[PDB]
Amino acid sequence: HMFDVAKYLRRIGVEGTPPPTLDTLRHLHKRHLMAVPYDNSTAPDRLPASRHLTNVPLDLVFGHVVTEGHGGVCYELNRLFHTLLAELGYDVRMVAAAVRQANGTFGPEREHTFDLVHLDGRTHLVDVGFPGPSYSEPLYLSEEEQHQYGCSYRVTEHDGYRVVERRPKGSDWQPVYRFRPELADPSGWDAVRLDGTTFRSRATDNGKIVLIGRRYFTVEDGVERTKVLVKADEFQDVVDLILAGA
Numbered sequence: 377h378m379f380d381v382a383k384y385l386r387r388i389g390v391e392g393t394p395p396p397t398l399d400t401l402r403h404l405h406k407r408h409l410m411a412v413p414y415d416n417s418t419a420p421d422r423l424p425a426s427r428h429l430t431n432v433p434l435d436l437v438f439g440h441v442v443t444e445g446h447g448g449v450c451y452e453l454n455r456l457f458h459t460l461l462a463e464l465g466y467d468v469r470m471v472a473a474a475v476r477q478a479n480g481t482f483g484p485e486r487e488h489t490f491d492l493v494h495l496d497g498r499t500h501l502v503d504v505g506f507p508g509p510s511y512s513e514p515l516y517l518s519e520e521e522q523h524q525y526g527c528s529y530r531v532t533e534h535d536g537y538r539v540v541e542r543r544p545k546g547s548d549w550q551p552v553y554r555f556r557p558e559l560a561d562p563s564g565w566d567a568v569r570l571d572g573t574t575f576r577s578r579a580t581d582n583g584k585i586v587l588i589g590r591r592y593f594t595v596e597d598g599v600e601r602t603k604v605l606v607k608a609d610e611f612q613d614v615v616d617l618i619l620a621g622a
């Protein structure tokens with residue numbers, strides 16, 4: 377189907393057309409993460425031969441995620457959300473980032489794609505398309521510590537980058553990803569180049585649930601628990617729980 381704001385809001389459980397304020401942005405962001413799961417299971421099926429994101433019609437993505445109710449990956453979910461926010465009146469700018477790996481280092485510079493919103497003189501980070509543990513409500517572009525559902529966040533400056541860092545209960549600060557704010561671009565999605573483990577996740581009311589391969593992670597009010605799933609029926613119950621949304 378063709379991109380439609382009203383249909384999208386209905387998909388994520390938002391009623392009416394709330395006004396273009398910070399309180400609305402916080403609600404949209406959290407509802408989107410609860411309703412629309414991250415899922416890379418069929419991402420390669422939507423890759424274009426040319427590696428230019430522009431050759432992937434926005435309507436194809438909209439059909440898969442909003443009309444048919446499936447999940448997607450960062451350059452699908454945040455691409456759609458950018459378009460929704462722009463239609464709702466926000467000043468949204470696209471930015472790319474390098475992700476802190478499982479080995480502790482940062483990956484390629486443009487692996488991850490998300491957005492910034494400038495509103496009433498402050499800049500907020502917007503990301504509804506990151507598979508791992510991260511923020512469910514927008515962050516201020518500030519090194520000042522910020523708290524959401526028992527987790528702490530901050531956006532520090534290191535070596536020409538801004539670094540999103542997260543600190544759950546009983547753990548030290550850990551980078552999530554890093555980006556260059558000066559490379560943000562209102563039209564950045566039109567320039568994105570797309571040059572075996574399954575990753576699925578979604579937010580809950582008070583945290584997030586994440587399944588990478590057999591590794592099942594939950595955070596609830598900042599309290600983390602992990603379990604390497606063995607049984608086939610428990611594994612499928614966890615997949616269904618994530619993909620059904622909330």
Ligand SMILES: *SCCNC(=O)CCNC(=O)[C@H](O)C(C)(C)CO
Pocket residue numbers: 449450451475476477478487488489505506507508509575588
């Ligand atoms: S389209 C966005 C691509 N980025 C991406 O898949 C990040 C995956 N990596 C992580 O999420 C992180 O490095 C782990 C493995 C530590 C899990 O959060």
